[PDB]
């Protein structure tokens, strides 16, 4: 391609323009109502027991009349607690491994370069 950087420049410029417009819209929304988000949402537990940010959709009938919305479950039964604990323990194992590896790397680096100690 003759000038590939032109495409990158155009993409960056369009991203900047969209950023400016969205910033103006966000400032106006904060001034008029104060909502930090343009789309309604909520914090709910799914069937798997993890907190999720559910983004609301738009319908024509209220939620209690809706069939598909009512079929979806937003509560977790007690059998997911053990799996949540297992996930937490797995994350703890990964974090501990990362920390120990970082400490080992620091010790090896100090051994190899004495003037880091000095």
């Amino acid at each position: 391609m003759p000038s590939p950087e032109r495409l990158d420049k155009v993409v960056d410029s369009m991203d900047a323009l969209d950023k400016v417009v969205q910033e103006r819209e966000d400032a106006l929304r904060l001034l008029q109502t104060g909502q930090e988000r343009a789309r309604p949402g909520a914090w709910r537990r799914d069937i798997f027991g993890r907190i999720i940010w559910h983004k609301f959709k738009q319908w024509v009938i209220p939620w209690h009349l809706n069939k598909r919305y009512n079929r979806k479950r937003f509560f977790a039964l007690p059998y997911v607690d053990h799996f949540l604990r297992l996930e937490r323990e797995k994350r703890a194992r990964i974090k501990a491994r990362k920390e120990n590896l970082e400490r080992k790397k620091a010790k090896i680096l100090l051994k190899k370069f004495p003037h880091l100690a000095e």
């Binding site: 297992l86 323990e89 703890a92 194992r93």
Partner: protein
């Protein structure tokens, strides 16, 4: 095959670093300090292995009794299985009776 063709790099051991120079200090803290401190109070390690000694079954039982509630699910299950296996082995197997 099975043996290295090059000499390993030489290993330098500082016989006079801080730990080697100060190793053994305060081992007689009780004798020389009016018995305010016990030498086993200088033990740094697991909570269940401070000032105590025993075989593998005893160590497993002590660990389960001390920190059993804080262990992860998999580790606790493995500890229970190990205790059962060691119990069976020690109480039901051996040359001597």
């Amino acid at each position: 095959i099975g043996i290295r063709l090059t000499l390993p790099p030489p290993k330098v051991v500082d016989r006079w670093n801080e730990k080697r120079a100060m190793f053994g200090v305060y081992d007689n803290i009780g004798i020389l300090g009016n018995f305010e401190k016990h030498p086993k109070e200088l033990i740094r390690g697991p909570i269940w292995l401070r000032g105590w000694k025993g075989n593998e079954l005893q160590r497993c039982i002590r660990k389960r009794k001390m920190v059993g509630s804080r262990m992860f699910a998999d580790d606790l299950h493995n500890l229970n299985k190990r205790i059962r296996y060691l119990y069976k082995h020690f109480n039901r197997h051996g040359k001597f009776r």
